[PDB]
Design a protein around this ligand. Structure first.
Ligand SMILES: CCCCCCCCCCCCCCCCCCCC(=O)O[C@H](COC(=O)CCCCCCCCCCCCCC)COP(=O)(O)OCCN
Ligand SMILES: CCCCCCCCCCCCCCCCCCCC(=O)O[C@H](COC(=O)CCCCCCCCCCCCCC)COP(=O)(O)OCCN
Ligand SMILES: CC(C)CCC[C@@H](C)[C@H]1CC[C@H]2[C@@H]3CC=C4C[C@@H](O)CC[C@]4(C)[C@H]3CC[C@]12C
Ligand SMILES: CC(C)CCC[C@@H](C)[C@H]1CC[C@H]2[C@@H]3CC=C4C[C@@H](O)CC[C@]4(C)[C@H]3CC[C@]12C
Ligand SMILES: CC(C)CCC[C@@H](C)[C@H]1CC[C@H]2[C@@H]3CC=C4C[C@@H](O)CC[C@]4(C)[C@H]3CC[C@]12C
Ligand SMILES: CC(C)CCC[C@@H](C)[C@H]1CC[C@H]2[C@@H]3CC=C4C[C@@H](O)CC[C@]4(C)[C@H]3CC[C@]12C
Lengths: 53, 53
């Protein structure tokens, strides 16, 4: 039972890592917008920012 | 008739000038707001300006 759980967890980890490595490699670039709350009416703040992880 | 019209116009002018001289002398200070049109959404513009004639 311990061996089977180790195998199951290793297979789940393999699935997750294979999925993660398959990500677009441009998925680390996302557009972000600080315009909630009182900054919504703020015009000195651009509509959106180019962030990169 | 010309003399009477001159007298009438002079009296009307006296009334107007007496009114004008009686103005508050602070009536030359007025608050003005450039917030029509697309500047309404503009936050870099204060709500109102202190103008003086
Ligand atoms: C043997 C393992 C090698 C597996 C690599 C196969 C996939 C290659 C993917 C494309 C080739 C490449 O250089 O571009 C990036 C992968 O490079 C890489 O990241 C390849 C680097 C591999 C390094 C492995 C060296 C040591 C292996 C184990 C040692 C113990 C793409 O990047 P992406 O995958 O995000 O884009 C989606 C990719 N279809
Ligand atoms: C004789 C004419 C003089 C008439 C003046 C009588 C009204 C005085 C008003 C207050 C006194 C003062 O100095 O304050 C300002 C008037 O001064 C002034 O402006 C007084 C200056 C008068 C100059 C006249 C000198 C020459 C007269 C004709 C020559 C030809 C007020 O200012 P305000 O009237 O706006 O505020 C409402 C005033 N109750
Ligand atoms: C233990 C061994 C079999 C692991 C091998 C890696 C496997 C699990 C990886 C490698 C490539 C991966 C796939 C790559 C792309 C996609 C498309 C996506 O829209 C859904 C997930 C899916 C379908 C992934 C599922 C997991 C996957 C099949
Ligand atoms: C540790 C275990 C739970 C890992 C299991 C794999 C995880 C990491 C991944 C592999 C493929 C992934 C799925 C791929 C595609 C989609 C379709 C999308 O519209 C909603 C998310 C969903 C349904 C993903 C959910 C998470 C997912 C199941
Ligand atoms: C030819 C002679 C009689 C001219 C004398 C000046 C007269 C016409 C001026 C001097 C003071 C003036 C008044 C000063 C203040 C006010 C109050 C305002 O709420 C209405 C106008 C009114 C009532 C003005 C009317 C004109 C007025 C009476
Ligand atoms: C050349 C002629 C027409 C000059 C006549 C006098 C003019 C300059 C002035 C003298 C007093 C003034 C009035 C004084 C007070 C008021 C009340 C206000 O709620 C509306 C304007 C009104 C009704 C003004 C209209 C203009 C007026 C009549």
């Amino acid at each position: 039972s311990c061996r089977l759980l180790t195998l199951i967890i290793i297979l789940l980890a393999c699935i997750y890592l294979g999925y993660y490595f398959s990500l677009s490699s441009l998925s680390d670039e996302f557009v972000c917008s600080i315009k909630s709350g009182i900054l919504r009416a703020d015009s000195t703040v651009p509509d959106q920012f180019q962030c990169k992880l």
